[PDB]
């Protein structure tokens, strides 16, 4: 079998305030901005895990649970919850860090899939992954099914592409 | 029954070149940037359909099919493929418009879900939707299943949230 | 004579909301931002018409007819209204798309001149242009005079340059 | 008669390097960016002259004389060359400051028209303007004709608006 | 005496790749950008420590030890090394996280001073600070002298301000 | 001895309004943004003095004297106050230009150190510097001590680096 890394090894933090330039609606963060930051921190985690350059292959989901207001401090935590052959599932959690009353509510949750690449751009084999704490193993344990859904979606999506191609 | 709008009514175009500031890897567009633009054009389509302010509730998927290089002209086409009670499924297609050889290859495909909101922020009833051309009815016809998958995912995702809440 | 393209062939749309970062005055779009977007969409239209890389040679005019507020949806429509030897006149129309009451008032109007360039940067011959609908032929019919004014202005402007050169 | 300010009083400088994010073509500044900066420095000059908030009413012209490359230092000099009742003509000169060989070639030239506004947004009377040095009086002396051209263009432009309005 | 927080309580991480838009020189991060990010993460740490809104009162130093290239992953670690009455000294460390060979070289080091503010903008009392690990107590132990230097500099700086005021 | 330039030769101005995107707190400029602009204008002055490419070696200080609000016009004046062998001390003054009541209060004051570099990146000898007006000679006369402080700080800072290196 392959070399294995702990989910803790690639675990990445990012803290960032919401500035007016991140908003669309009055004092409310715009989803596109949030998505760009999610992709940023997730890509960094995939790089650490893969020890390589990575690209986003797909955004499997972003659930926006809560409105995020200007001034809010956001904590992003990305980790690798699943390692395929050349691919990684990164799960990102985004919390609002309210310094005034010390709550850290979950504001969003995202799954993305990254592919590790060579010096010359072909998909590159990534190490395996194992959890240590409880959260890590929750994401680790529930990943096989998400991988499963993704396969079906990749089937349907190919159907759509092929239809558009002939039109 | 409710009032109905044609998918053509809310159909929105966006053309945008990829500039160095949109890239991460050498001369290659960064996924976060692409996601932000997808969300921008999708939100505009949802607004036109809903006749209202909208927020992104979830990013159901983004499939990145092709590398997008600096200089590339991107065409975004967003439309409403499904109307729930207060929600809309927007499908966005992103093509590279190669002016040199007149190909318009599909570079990415995205589904997002928007919720129309009041003047005071409660979810607002949206009109129904019907297709006219063939592409529109392809996305219209395949939407019920995607809605279905989303329900299961919203079930699993709630499980995850509840686990994290107690840790 | 040369090959001819319909003004409809290069006709480009762009939809974009005004975000706080686009403003200067309270909730009011800044003219520089509007000008940058005008140049973006105009350049894309010139590229489609020319089948080539282009540069902005001059901004012949931008008339700001109406204040544009934060949140406003802007529709940009660029088309080629005149084809010289290596140059194109792009006219851009900018409308506020008010989804709430379905008006599409003209917020700005711009004329720019682009030059199509080689792989090696010399000016490149562009195809001719002909209108099809009524708007297209309005811009097509009124272009010869604008071309004319531009010649006089290019005369005066050369005088100014030459004066500054000796000071 | 009204109070008069010297063109030197409102004369504004701006120095700014061209960074990769300002470019479109490889290592070449994008025209939209240049236009945004032109509008920025011109607006500051109009504010100093008017002693008030201003808006851009029109971009009368931007002549792009020279390619501007990444790294280039740009010097913007804005001044008021003409004062109407509530309006100002700002002329902006943009030079490349080559620190290596001490040339300061004219890279672009722009005329814009600003309107000074109240606390409540109505057009506000501006002071008159007089030149002191030779350049100032060149722009001062040649302004009456430019004002003249602008009147004719504002006539034609109104015709265009009215045509589009009925279509 | 006042309430005390561990330096670990307010310790904040930030991971961020260097993108082309962060650079000035070819593929080299621009110092201003680095400074903006330093200020961002430092402000977040001060907020967590203070449990309040903060402003940057001064940048006591930024030592740029190493060139930072495009693509580089930067790790920012901010902590409070000194607590005055209403002020905090935040020390930020910036490391290049080379995922390819697992070195984490120190690329920059910064000290800043923040002031915690009310709901109404007056300086607000902050808790005290104590270290736990070795690094924390190194910064904790060497802070009194830095505070000292700052006093002398604030003396000289006041002299300069007063000179400029009369000119 | 070496060639000498007047402090007036490299003296650079920059005028820039504060836009919403420059703020963090409501209508208040963010310190990081101010620092980025300070570094921009200072780098331009160092380039003019050095006749060369430069990098920021250190930010010796930024004193934020006054809150800077959205809309404020900022005037940056950078000059070289000290020339070492390959290094320059740039002092930047930032004033709020209140066009409404013609005050120009000092909002911030910064010292930075730049190193001039070759075509191949080694430190490059800079010309000497001499003052002409009173302000110039104030900064010129007080520089030797600041240079002095910097030496001590560079001593302490090296100690810190070496401690972190073994941990």
If DSSP states are collapsed to H, E and C, what string results for chain A? CCCEEEHHHHCEEEEEECCHHHEEECCEECHHHHHHHHHHHHHHHHHHHHCCEEEEEEEEEEEECCCCECCCEEEEEEEEEEECCCEEEEEEEEEEEECCCCEEEEEEEEEEEEEEECCCCCECCCCEEECCCHHHHHHHHHHHHHHHHHHHHHHHHHHHHHHHHCC
Measured CA to CA, the distance from residue B15 to residue C11 in angstroms comes to 11
Output the six-digit token pair for E138: 């190194």
Measured CA to CA, the distance from residue E31 to residue F55 in angstroms comes to 8
Residue E100 annotated as binding site: no
Using N-to-C axis directions, what is the helix angle for E31-50 and F31-50, rounded to 10°? 150
Query: Taking a C-beta distance cutoff of 8 angstroms, is the pair D106, D55 a contact?
Result: no
Select from C72, A32, A61 the least CA-distant residue to B53.
Answer: C72
Measured CA to CA, the distance from residue C132 to residue C40 in angstroms comes to 24
* B50 CB-near residues (< 8 Å, 6+ apart): B88, B114, B116, B124, B126, B127, C99
> How far is the alpha carbon of B19 from chain D, nearest alpha carbon, in Å?
5
Nearest to E39 among F32, F152, F163 (CB): F32
| Pick among E29, E39, E133 to test the F interface (most F CBs inside 10 A) | E39
Neighbors of chain E by Cβ distance (3+ pairs < 8 Å): A, B, D, F
Select from E76, E119, E67, E69 the least CA-distant residue to E95.
Answer: E76
Residue numbers in the known binding site of D for CoA are 29, 56, 63-65, 85-87, 154
CB contact under 8 Å between B24 and E21, yes or no, is no
Residues 106-145 of A with CB under 8 A from F: none
| CB atoms closer than 10 angstroms to residue A122 | 10
Q: Do chains D and B touch (3 or more CB pairs under 8 A)?
A: yes
User: Which residue blocks in chain C are alpha helix, DSSP H?
Assistant: 7-10, 31-50, 134-165
| CB atoms closer than 10 angstroms to residue A152 | 11
Expressed as residue numbers, the domain containing B145 is 1-167
Measured CA to CA, the distance from residue C44 to residue C14 in angstroms comes to 10
Nearest to F17 among D44, D51, D73 (CB): D44
Length of chain E: 167
| End-to-end Cα spacing for chain E | 46
Record the resolution, in angstroms. Answer: 2.5
What value, to the nearest 5°, has the Cα angle with vertex E79 and ends E75 and E82? 150
* E100 CB-near residues (< 8 Å, 6+ apart): A51, A52
Pairing verdict, β F53-64 and F106-117: antiparallel
CB contact under 8 Å between B15 and C97, yes or no, is no
| CB atoms closer than 10 angstroms to residue E56 | 22
Output the six-digit token pair for C40: 């973006």
Query: Taking a C-beta distance cutoff of 8 angstroms, is the pair E145, F156 a contact?
Result: yes
C21/A contact by beta carbon, under 8 A: yes
Residue B116: φ, ψ to 5°: -80, 140
Nearest to A36 among B32, B57, B106 (CB): B32
Measured CA to CA, the distance from residue A37 to residue A75 in angstroms comes to 11
User: Which residue blocks in chain B are alpha helix, DSSP H?
Assistant: 7-10, 31-50, 134-165
Query: Taking a C-beta distance cutoff of 8 angstroms, is the pair B27, B69 a contact?
Result: yes
Residue written as token pair 């199509």 = C116
Residue B19 with chain D: CB contacts under 8 Å: 21, 23-24, 30
Measured CA to CA, the distance from residue C47 to residue C21 in angstroms comes to 28
Select from E56, E123, E55, E43 the least CA-distant residue to E85.
Answer: E123
What value, to the nearest 5°, has the Cα angle with vertex A91 and ends B155 and A128? 120
User: Which residue blocks in E7-133 are alpha helix, DSSP H?
Assistant: 7-10, 31-50
Q: What DSSP string runs through F57-122? A: EEEEEEEE-S--BTT-EEEEEEEEEEE-SSEEEEEEEEEE-BTTTTB--EEEEEEEEEEEE-SSSS
Measured CA to CA, the distance from residue E65 to residue E43 in angstroms comes to 22
Query: Taking a C-beta distance cutoff of 8 angstroms, is the pair E51, F60 a contact?
Result: no
C-alpha D88: how far from chain center: 10
Alpha-carbon torsion, ordered B88, A113, B160, B82, to 10 deg: 10
Cα distances from A167 to residues B8, B67, B89, F1, F158, in angstroms, run 16, 22, 22, 77, 66
Q: Do chains C and D touch (3 or more CB pairs under 8 A)?
A: yes
Measured CA to CA, the distance from residue D49 to residue D11 in angstroms comes to 9
Measured CA to CA, the distance from residue C20 to residue F22 in angstroms comes to 11
Report the DSSP beta bridge partners of residue C56.
C114
Residue E15 with chain A: CB contacts under 8 Å: 12-14, 41, 44
Q: State the DSSP code for C69.
A: B
Measured CA to CA, the distance from residue A78 to residue A75 in angstroms comes to 10
Nearest to E32 among F28, F39, F156 (CB): F39
Measured CA to CA, the distance from residue A75 to residue A94 in angstroms comes to 5
E157/F contact by beta carbon, under 8 A: yes
Residue A131: φ, ψ to 5°: -85, 170
E65/D contact by beta carbon, under 8 A: no
Domains held by chain B: number: 1
| Pick among C18, C24, C29 to test the F interface (most F CBs inside 10 A) | C24
What value, to the nearest 5°, has the Cα angle with vertex C116 and ends C115 and C117? 115
Pairing verdict, β D23-25 and C28-29: unpaired
Query: Taking a C-beta distance cutoff of 8 angstroms, is the pair F77, F93 a contact?
Result: yes
Cα distances from B137 to residues B27, B127, B141, in angstroms, run 36, 17, 6
Cα distances from A65 to residues B33, B40, B53, in angstroms, run 22, 19, 18
CB contact under 8 Å between E55 and F31, yes or no, is yes
Residue A20 is part of a domain; what is its CATH number? Answer: 3.10.129.10
* D97 CB-near residues (< 8 Å, 6+ apart): D15, D73, D74, D75, D104, F48
Q: Helix %, strand %, coil % for chain C, to 5?
A: 35, 40, 25
Q: Is D38 exposed, middle or buried (0-12, 13-18, 19+ CB in 10 A)?
A: buried
Select from A102, A56, A97, A99 the least CA-distant residue to A77.
Answer: A97
Query: Taking a C-beta distance cutoff of 8 angstroms, is the pair D58, D71 a contact?
Result: no
Residue E41 with chain F: CB contacts under 8 Å: none
Query: Taking a C-beta distance cutoff of 8 angstroms, is the pair E142, F158 a contact?
Result: no
Q: What DSSP string runs through F2-61? A: --EEEHHHH-EEEEEEPPGGGEEETTEE-HHHHHHHHHHHHHHHHHHHHTSEEEEEEEEE
Query: Taking a C-beta distance cutoff of 8 angstroms, is the pair E42, E110 a contact?
Result: yes
Alpha-carbon torsion, ordered F82, F84, F88, F94, to 10 deg: -20
Output the six-digit token pair for A147: 């991988």
Select from E52, E49, E104 the least CA-distant residue to E81.
Answer: E49
What string of H, E and C letters represents the secondary structure of chain D?
A: CCCEEEHHHHCEEEEEECCHHHEEECCEECHHHHHHHHHHHHHHHHHHHHCCEEEEEEEEEEEECCCCECCCEEEEEEEEEEECCCEEEEEEEEEECECCCCECCEEEEEEEEEEEECCCCCECCCCEEECCCHHHHHHHHHHHHHHHHHHHHHHHHHHHHHHHHCC
| End-to-end Cα spacing for chain F | 46
Q: What Rg value do the Cα atoms of chain E yield, rounded?
A: 17
Q: Helix %, strand %, coil % for chain B, to 5?
A: 35, 40, 25
Pairing verdict, β B23-25 and B28-29: antiparallel
Residue C10 annotated as binding site: no
Nearest chain F alpha carbon to E150: F61
Measured CA to CA, the distance from residue F64 to residue A138 in angstroms comes to 47
Measured CA to CA, the distance from residue F67 to residue F167 in angstroms comes to 39
Residue written as token pair 């990829």 = B18
Measured CA to CA, the distance from residue A74 to residue A105 in angstroms comes to 10
| CB atoms closer than 10 angstroms to residue E26 | 12
| CB atoms closer than 10 angstroms to residue A150 | 20
Per DSSP, which regions of E97-135 are E strands? 106-117, 128-130
D72/C contact by beta carbon, under 8 A: no
Pairing verdict, β B23-25 and B4-6: unpaired
């Amino acid at each position: 079998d392959r070399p294995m890394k702990s989910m803790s090894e690639s675990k990445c933090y990012k803290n960032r305030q919401v500035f007016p330039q991140d908003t669309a609606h009055h004092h409310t963060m715009f989803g596109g901005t949030l998505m760009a930051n999610i992709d940023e921190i997730a890509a960094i985690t995939a790089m650490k895990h893969a020890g390589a350059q990575v690209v986003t292959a797909s955004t499997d989901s972003v659930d926006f649970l809560k409105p995020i207001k200007t001034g809010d401090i956001l904590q992003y935590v990305a980790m690798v919850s699943y390692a395929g052959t050349s691919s990684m599932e990164v799960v990102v959690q985004i919390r609002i860090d309210d310094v005034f009353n010390n709550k850290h509510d979950l504001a969003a949750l995202s799954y993305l899939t990254f592919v590790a690449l060579d010096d010359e751009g072909k998909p590159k084999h990534v190490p395996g992954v194992y959890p240590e704490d409880d959260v890590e193993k929750w994401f680790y344990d529930t990943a096989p099914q998400r991988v499963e859904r993704r396969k079906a979606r990749r089937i349907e999506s190919k159907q759509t592409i092929e239809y558009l191609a002939q039109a």
